[PDB]
């Protein structure tokens, strides 16, 4: 039966990344973000915390040829192709600068106010694919991968996906921004103003209801400062912005 109300980061509180709220920066990598955190956080839950790991996004970005324009946008099933075939080494924010390849990019703010410097318009180049790890971390580049062995697209249905998220834990998904996206602040977001701004990809880790209106729980890749401290919640059973037509996830095992 489904509940209520989930949340992974309460289910699985031992796993560190599924309440890390990561920055893509200034580069459209969001669908290597929503990968690598999901793939994070499986790793973790389906090895029963074996596996605590940072999965790195620039490691995806950058050496997954078959996964779109890396910052200039990316495909979701490929990049869960290549973490089951390839797989991913280890990697953390730059500010962190851990594991064998942590992110390039600062953080910034994505059309919102806070600490940090505004993103602006312009985007970075897609770093190069380098296949080394950082000259402090003593594991070989091959020999950092962490693979899945499956992947698939989850059924456009609201209960499938719960099922699957509450089973396998958070998933990605794919949905359409439109410009008031850019103005989310806090809230059920629904799109009710603006264009089409083409897709965005984030990490759906639960569900909740407040005041009779349904929604997911779902960490964007925009640092702490936007939305709900990195989170925002979105409507739930009406296919919100294709919210639950481009569901993918994968399993380790
Ligand atoms: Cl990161």
């Not at 099922?163 to 629904?190: C, Q």
């Amino acid at each position: 039966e489904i509940p209520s109300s989930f949340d992974s980061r309460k289910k699985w509180p031992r796993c560190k990344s599924i309440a890390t709220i990561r920055d893509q920066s200034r580069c459209g990598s969001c669908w290597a973000f929503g990968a690598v955190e999901a793939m994070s956080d499986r790793s973790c839950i389906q090895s029963g915390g074996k596996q605590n790991v940072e999965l790195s996004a620039v490691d995806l970005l950058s050496c997954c040829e078959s996964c779109g324009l890396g910052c200039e946008g990316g495909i979701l099933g490929p990049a869960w192709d290549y973490w089951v075939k390839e797989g991913i080494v280890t990697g953390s924010s730059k500010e962190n600068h851990a594991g064998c390849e942590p992110y390039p990019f600062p953080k910034c703010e994505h059309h919102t106010k806070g600490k940090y410097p505004p993103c602006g318009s312009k985007i970075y180049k897609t770093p190069r694919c380098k296949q080394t790890c950082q000259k402090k971390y003593k594991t070989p580049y091959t020999q950092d991968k962490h693979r899945g062995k499956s992947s698939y697209n989850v059924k456009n249905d609201e209960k499938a996906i719960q099922k699957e998220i509450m089973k396998y834990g958070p998933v990605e998904a794919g949905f359409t921004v439109y410009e008031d996206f850019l103005n989310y602040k806090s809230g059920i977001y629904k799109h009710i103003t603006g264009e089409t701004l083409g897709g965005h990809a984030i990490r759906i880790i639960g569900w909740g209801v407040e005041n009779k209106a349904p929604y997911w729980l779902i960490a964007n890749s925009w640092n702490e400062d936007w939305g709900e401290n990195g989170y925002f919640r979105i409507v739930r059973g009406r296919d919100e912005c294709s919210i639950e037509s481009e569901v993918t996830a994968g399993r380790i095992n």
